[PDB]
Amino acid sequence: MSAFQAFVVNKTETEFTAGVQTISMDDLPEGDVLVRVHYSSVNYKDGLASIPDGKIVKTXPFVPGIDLAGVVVSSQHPRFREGDEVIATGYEIGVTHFGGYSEYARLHGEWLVPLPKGLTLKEAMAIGTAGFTAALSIHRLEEHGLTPERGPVLVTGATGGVGSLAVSMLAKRGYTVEASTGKAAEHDYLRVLGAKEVLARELDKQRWAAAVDPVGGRTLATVLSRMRYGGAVAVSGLTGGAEVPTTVHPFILRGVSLLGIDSVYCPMDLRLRIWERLAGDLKPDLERIAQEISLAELPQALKRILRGELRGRTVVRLA
Amino acid sequence: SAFQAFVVNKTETEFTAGVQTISMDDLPEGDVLVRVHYSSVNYKDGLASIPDGKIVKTXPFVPGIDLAGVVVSSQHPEGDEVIATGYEIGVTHFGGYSEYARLHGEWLVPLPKGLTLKEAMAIGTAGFTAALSIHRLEEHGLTPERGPVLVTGATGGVGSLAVSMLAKRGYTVEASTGKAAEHDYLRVLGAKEVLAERIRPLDKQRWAAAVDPVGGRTLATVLSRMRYGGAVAVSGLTGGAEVPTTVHPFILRGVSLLGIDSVYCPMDLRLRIWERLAGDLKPDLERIAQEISLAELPQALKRILRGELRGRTVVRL
Ligand SMILES: [Cl-]
Numbered sequence: 001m002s003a004f005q006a007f008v009v010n011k012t013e014t015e016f017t018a019g020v021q022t023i024s025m026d027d028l029p030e031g032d033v034l035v036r037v038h039y040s041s042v043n044y045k046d047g048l049a050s051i052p053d054g055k056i057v058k059t060x061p062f063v064p065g066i067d068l069a070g071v072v073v074s075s076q077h078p079r080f081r082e083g084d085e086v087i088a089t090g091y092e093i094g095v096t097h098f099g100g101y102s103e104y105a106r107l108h109g110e111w112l113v114p115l116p117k118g119l120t121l122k123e124a125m126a127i128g129t130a131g132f133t134a135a136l137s138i139h140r141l142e143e144h145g146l147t148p149e150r151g152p153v154l155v156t157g158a159t160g161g162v163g164s165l166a167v168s169m170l171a172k173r174g175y176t177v178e179a180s181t182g183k184a185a186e187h188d189y190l191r192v193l194g195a196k197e198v199l200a201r202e203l204d205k206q207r208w209a210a211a212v213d214p215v216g217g218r219t220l221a222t223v224l225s226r227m228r229y230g231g232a233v234a235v236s237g238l239t240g241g242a243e244v245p246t247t248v249h250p251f252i253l254r255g256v257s258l259l260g261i262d263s264v265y266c267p268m269d270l271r272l273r274i275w276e277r278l279a280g281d282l283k284p285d286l287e288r289i290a291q292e293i294s295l296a297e298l299p300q301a302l303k304r305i306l307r308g309e310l311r312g313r314t315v316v317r318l319a
Numbered sequence: 320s321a322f323q324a325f326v327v328n329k330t331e332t333e334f335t336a337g338v339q340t341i342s343m344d345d346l347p348e349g350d351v352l353v354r355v356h357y358s359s360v361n362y363k364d365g366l367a368s369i370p371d372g373k374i375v376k377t378x379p380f381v382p383g384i385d386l387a388g389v390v391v392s393s394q395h396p397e398g399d400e401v402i403a404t405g406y407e408i409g410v411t412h413f414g415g416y417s418e419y420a421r422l423h424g425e426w427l428v429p430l431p432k433g434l435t436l437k438e439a440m441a442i443g444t445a446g447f448t449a450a451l452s453i454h455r456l457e458e459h460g461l462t463p464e465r466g467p468v469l470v471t472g473a474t475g476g477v478g479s480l481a482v483s484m485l486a487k488r489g490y491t492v493e494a495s496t497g498k499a500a501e502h503d504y505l506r507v508l509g510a511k512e513v514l515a516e517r518i519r520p521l522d523k524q525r526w527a528a529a530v531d532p533v534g535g536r537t538l539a540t541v542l543s544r545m546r547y548g549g550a551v552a553v554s555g556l557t558g559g560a561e562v563p564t565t566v567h568p569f570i571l572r573g574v575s576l577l578g579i580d581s582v583y584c585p586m587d588l589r590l591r592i593w594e595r596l597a598g599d600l601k602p603d604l605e606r607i608a609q610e611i612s613l614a615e616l617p618q619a620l621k622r623i624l625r626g627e628l629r630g631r632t633v634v635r636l
Contacts, residue, residue: 221561221562225559239516240516241518241543242516242543242568243565244539244562245563245565250560307520308517
């Protein structure tokens with residue numbers, strides 16, 4: 001009792017550790033809500049938190065994991081009584097504040113999202129930050145004019161977390177989806193998620209009514225060449241390094257919008273709206289996208305996402 | 320008198336591009352009359368063989384940035400084997416997709432010893448660009464002991480030729496392409512390994528130089544795996560839109576970006592590059608060149624435009 005396991009990253013005098021070890025209740029930082037973590041997931045950002053030069057974590061003894069789903073053990077009066085299934089993504093979690101790769105997490109009441117009717121904690125983590133990023137992107141495109149009747153929608157990080165999830169969300173909304181990836185042997189998978197066409201990495205001059213780029217932008221010059229007049233691109237994520245900028249001219253000439261999607265600091269009112277959508281009209285096909293691993297299998301998954309060999313979504317069952 | 324030529328034309332009804340017979344009066348002014356033996360198909364030539372290819376602006380025109388043949392009449396220091404590359408040859412002044420071509424002597428380069436007319440065109444603009452690239456890199460300090468050289472030209476004209484050239488030069492070459500069927504082909508040119516950005520493994524400084532023949536398309540990923548001091552030779556055009564780079568990576572590692580212009584290259588260097596092309600920069604053309612007749616030219620022009628031509632293709636008139 002009061003002694004549980006967590007993936008911990010450390011950095012002393014020219015030495016780096018990253019493994020599952022046992023930690024205590026007192027190692028958890030200041031919070032007003034105590035949560036027993038049922039699930040977490042693996043994100044690329046979480047991969048960067050597991051390595052020294054990742055440029056995410058800037059403080060030593062740390063518990064990564066930007067994603068959380070579980071049950072309230074104890075807390076305060078922030079609208080949370082024990083036994084409540086709560087979700088926690090974004091903010092300082094897994095970056096500045098101890099995160100979800102732990103059996104227990106201690107957080108601020110202002111960061112929790114009461115689990116919407118229509119989602120399991122596992123399904124909530126299967127979606128995770130990635131799904132939130134995908135949902136917000138589509139949400140944002142839709143208030144900007146996107147409907148299935150405007151034309152096909154391109155998605156470029158198709159096999160990754162955000163990409164797989166977006167394809168699914170768009171296909172189930174009735175959109176004609178074209179998906180692009182850089183790995184062959186990924187085509188069948190993309191079609192199963194509902195993509196009508198799949199593109200090998202590389203009508204005249206205006207095919208897509210909208211696009212979703214979850215790779216920091218880095219295929220923007222490709223996406224801009226075949227954008228319809230009035231279209232938009234929702235961009236999010238990181239590349240891998242090596243920034244890829246765009247010219248501005250193509251946005252001006254075709255009246256196209258670039259919508260920066262940030263899942264970290266999204267305000268609570270919108271956050272709640274997105275989670276309602278994720279429980280209803282933007283609920284993806286998690287059975288064909290997500291796979292589950294245990295806390296002890298986590299190190300390997302963080303290596304893989306960093307190397308770019310993780311497809312779809314990976315949820316971590318805690319304990 | 321009345322010879323054959325490939326003619327592009329565009330009125331206010333249609334666009335015509337076929338092989339018609341034109342006379343001596345159709346060629347524009349020039350002091351040197353060259354009877355063309357060989358020409359070459361180039362990406363640039365394909366754009367000039369089409370409407371919305373933004374290269375040919377005046378109406379009735381004969382494309383072909385590349386010229387090689389024998390002199391009929393001249394008044395500049397007859398029967399001289401000569402090559403013409405770049406300048407106004409593909410673009411503003413009538414080209415080499417014609418049995419005869421009139422040009423100015425300022426563009427002409429006497430065909431170097433150790434090279435054939437067909438070989439000069441197997442090389443052509445593409446080979447020149449590549450050779451001029453390598454050259455520009457070597458005078459920046461690049462040598463085989465600095466580390467491997469990362470081409471990206473792959474099966475572009477330029478690039479295929481770059482690999483062969485660097486391989487024959489003794490460099491370790493890493494070639495990049497997106498087509499899975501050209502892997503065996505790139506090793507025969509002499510590339511040590513074929514590449515299919517990730518931040519594990521350690522790829523963080525491993526290329527001494529780079530040849531980027533797609534308008535700096537791949538600069539963004541190249542730059543973050545350059546050795547401290549290296550350079551990158553960029554040339555040609557992209558498939559369409561322009562892809563910018565950040566400047567930080569250059570300052571950070573003391574890397575240079577070298578703009579390679581084949582079009583308006585100065586004569587003094589032009590000869591030096593061609594002498595090199597007849598010398599230690601002679602690519603193994605046995606594997607990289609192909610030959611077609613004039614009546615077959617339009618077909619290749621259609622293929623290069625849709626990226627269906629590997630290596631180099633010459634033309635016999
Ligand atoms: Cl559970």
